[PDB]
Amino acid sequence: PRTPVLWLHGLECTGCSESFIRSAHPLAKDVVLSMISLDYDDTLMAAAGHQAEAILEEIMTKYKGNYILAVEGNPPLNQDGMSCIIGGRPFIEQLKYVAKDAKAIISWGSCASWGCVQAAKPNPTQATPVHKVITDKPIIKVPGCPPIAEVMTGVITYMLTFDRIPELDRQGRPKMFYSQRIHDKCYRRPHFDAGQFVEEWDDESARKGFCLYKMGCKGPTTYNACSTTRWNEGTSFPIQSGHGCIGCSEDGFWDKGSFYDRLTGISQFG
Amino acid sequence: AYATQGFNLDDRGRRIVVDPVTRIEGHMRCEVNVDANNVIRNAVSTGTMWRGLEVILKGRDPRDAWAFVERICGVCTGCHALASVRAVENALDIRIPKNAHLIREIMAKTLQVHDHAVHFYHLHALDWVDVMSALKADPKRTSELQQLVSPAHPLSSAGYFRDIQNRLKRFVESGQLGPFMNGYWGSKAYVLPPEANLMAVTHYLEALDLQKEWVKIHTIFGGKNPHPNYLVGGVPCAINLDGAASAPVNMERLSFVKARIDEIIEFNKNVYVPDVLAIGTLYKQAGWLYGGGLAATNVLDYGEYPNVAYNKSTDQLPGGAILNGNWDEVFPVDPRDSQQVQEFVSHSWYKYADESVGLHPWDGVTEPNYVLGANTKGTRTRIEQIDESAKYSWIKSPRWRGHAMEVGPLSRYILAYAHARSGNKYAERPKEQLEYSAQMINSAIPKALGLPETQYTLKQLLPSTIGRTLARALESQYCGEMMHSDWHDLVANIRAGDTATANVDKWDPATWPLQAKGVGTVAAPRGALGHWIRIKDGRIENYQCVVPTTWNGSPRDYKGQIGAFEASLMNTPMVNPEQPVEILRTLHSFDPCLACSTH
Ligand code: NFU
Ligand code: SF4
Ligand code: SF4
Ligand code: F3S
Ligand SMILES: [Cl-]
Ligand SMILES: [Mg+2]
Ligand code: NA
Ligand code: NA
Ligand code: NA
């Protein structure tokens, strides 16, 4: 038998679901057909309305304390929770209900992990990360906007193989994917180390792949696997394609000033 | 009960609720009323989420806006970034270099293909395809069907279909049906034979594996997919052919992009378009021509993909507005005209100073107001039946000169057809596609499957759920073809000696006018997208988005006129009122993006 996954959606853009299906190793097809049982997921599921909601009860009963709750997006607390409505009720009520009997909870992406764009100032819906609402369950944060596809499926693969949560850092992120800053192994580091920087877009330095620090790159303060694992089966990552990291896996990255404002105190990242 | 736009709305019948609407992006609730014969006589579209990006953007730097609004949606990923940079560039009088234009067009067309194909197979197909019926299918007859539907597709042997069928069989036999759990399998609303179902489910699996390849085009130019990076003034992916290895774009990277484009063209031509033509033919033969809604009268798009940059007369999907089903008169659409695009909130969870009027988006206001009408059944936090006489959605109500319009690929294809018949040469390819498709649906496919020939015109065939689905597939094909040409133009320009990718003359806010306004429009996968910005002292004064699903999914306006979703559901019989198969089939034909609609 395959471990049930109930994949809930709060306030979100659905980019985490999309990233998930880009996975090449393993293929999402193989994850869905041979690894997990994806029993609830609004994006892909055949059933709607009453038939969809009835699945939750059935899986929770049959697999009590032996299903994974995956959460994409987050619950709003303003508007009496009705800035995100499921089955005529606030999303937060569904989240809490499904969370109570989960074996483990995966907070997909920066939405579930931290709050992300809807939680940026002034946060009109009081969108709140999952770990601030569910306080009595094991949660793994898999941040990024969205996370890398193979990181998402990598977490699932570990959990299914070992029936354990992988080792987490103090922020609740898996060390196997989030131990390095972008800047640690970024291929532009030799330019950073030599003070070789892009100063204006498409200057001669940019055409030579010089470091993007002075164009606002937040790689020095951002933990993710982008510089090594890279994106879409190792095809590229933001810096390789010419734009600085915007810090999309870090808590509160929308409210650290302009993406194009450089980090201060360059000497601390040498 | 009341009449509007030729629809006789009546809420006296049996009320049916569908919440959540699944196999869409984001959150929607749908309610309908059906008459004594299970025919829908009222429909209510409720957007059930809001995040408030327009509010969040206030006071921020226009150069950062694209990244915020990109996160409106990870499905139509990048189209908001494109609208944003266009809006800021329009505000600040910035002309981007040719290579940046071409790379943006390639990225846009890559999104079109990916979004369209994934939608059809992974969200829409299960409304037409019975997966349990596919288990009954005979592999050899499926092979023979595949050869008739698309001769050129190399994956066609009986053994191949047998292997696929076997994996599906043990999956279902396991007792853990996953995404197929509690489905509406066996409903009389399903009409395909087993072998067509097996063919389609096989292509669902093929498309799921292939779709990840196509987006590598985004990854090269924009670093990642979902959410590739954009830039005010151009693109960040600087060019060097040669130290070429160190530049974001070199010839090797461009050759990789071309290889991906070529694969896309094969998929659209051999898998996607043929499947939609075949499925459409079979449901046409069953008489399922419901779901036309507003497509039969009022359609709109801003127009997109000019052959010559900044020259709108050369749009390869030429736009405008059609009213009252008169395809001989296309009205020009101006997104700058305060009297054209306007949004009402009379029946939405927002407030204006005066809700009897619609606001043009440069004057738009986004203040939440979650309140339910007196005739609601249930409570503020436990709705049993929504009261559509009052405020019932997080989606605003966009109208054009007061008219309710349908937007999307179907709208663009009707507009293209109308333009082509006015003499517009830029629309010749979509006209060719439509005439080809009608001939296949009416004559060629029926002849090959031993069914009677029909004589539907495009005027009769296009305004329908089948037509809406067809237009999406044809648009995917056309977009693949267009970016193939864009790629050649890009490489030619670079080899001619123009390597420029960014205009930075007005990158620094010290160079900007102290006040400015701009608009950026995009033919997004689901229809007409616009971002309207006001800039003051280097900061965002106002930022308003009107998104395709905002148009299509909108609630009623001040005059009580219905939007595209609500109109499309009207007058549709349901086989079983508590199985929303027909509701899903038609709603899904719009490819609803609810996070987009509400932002
Ligand atoms: N296409 C599209 Fe989006 Ni997720 C919508 N509606 C965009 O603008
Ligand atoms: S984390 Fe980013 S990509 Fe994922 S749902 Fe949230 S906004 Fe979208
Ligand atoms: S600042 Fe950014 S571009 Fe430069 S070396 Fe560090 S991560 Fe790479
Ligand atoms: S913007 Fe995000 S995708 Fe990686 S390079 Fe930076 S953490
Ligand atoms: Cl965040
Ligand atoms: Mg808006
Ligand atoms: Na730099
Ligand atoms: Na552009
Ligand atoms: Na006609």
Author numbering:
A (entry chain S): 5 to 274
B (entry chain L): 3 to 244, 247 to 603
Task: Provide text from the study.
The MBH large subunit contains the catalytic center composed of a nickel and an iron ion, which are coordinated to the protein by four Cys-derived thiolates. The most distal cluster relative to the active site is a [4Fe–4S] cluster coordinated by three cysteines and a histidine, while the medial cluster is a [3Fe–4S] species with three cysteines as protein anchors. However, in the proximal position, instead of a standard Cys4[4Fe–4S] cluster, the O2-tolerant MBHs possess a [4Fe–3S] cluster coordinated by six cysteine residues.13–16 The unique architecture of the [4Fe–3S] cluster is associated with a redox-dependent structural flexibility that allows two redox-transitions within a physiological potential region, i.e., the cofactor can assume a super-oxidized, an oxidized, and a reduced state.
In contrast to the native [4Fe–3S] cluster, the bridging function of the Cys19-derived thiolate was replaced with a sulfide (S4) coordinating both Fe1 and Fe4. According to the electron density maps only ca. 20% of Fe3 remained in the native-like (“classical”) position, previously observed for the Fe3 in the native [4Fe–3S] cluster. Approximately 80% of Fe3 were shifted by 1.4 Å to a position corresponding to a cubane corner (Fe3′), thereby forming a bond to S4 instead of Cys120. In H2-reduced MBHC19G crystals, a major fraction of Fe3 is not covalently bound to Sγ-Cys120, which is in contrast to the reduced [4Fe–3S] cluster of native MBH. We interpreted this density as a mono-oxygen species with an occupancy of about 50%, causing a slightly enlarged Ni–Fe distance of 2.7 Å.
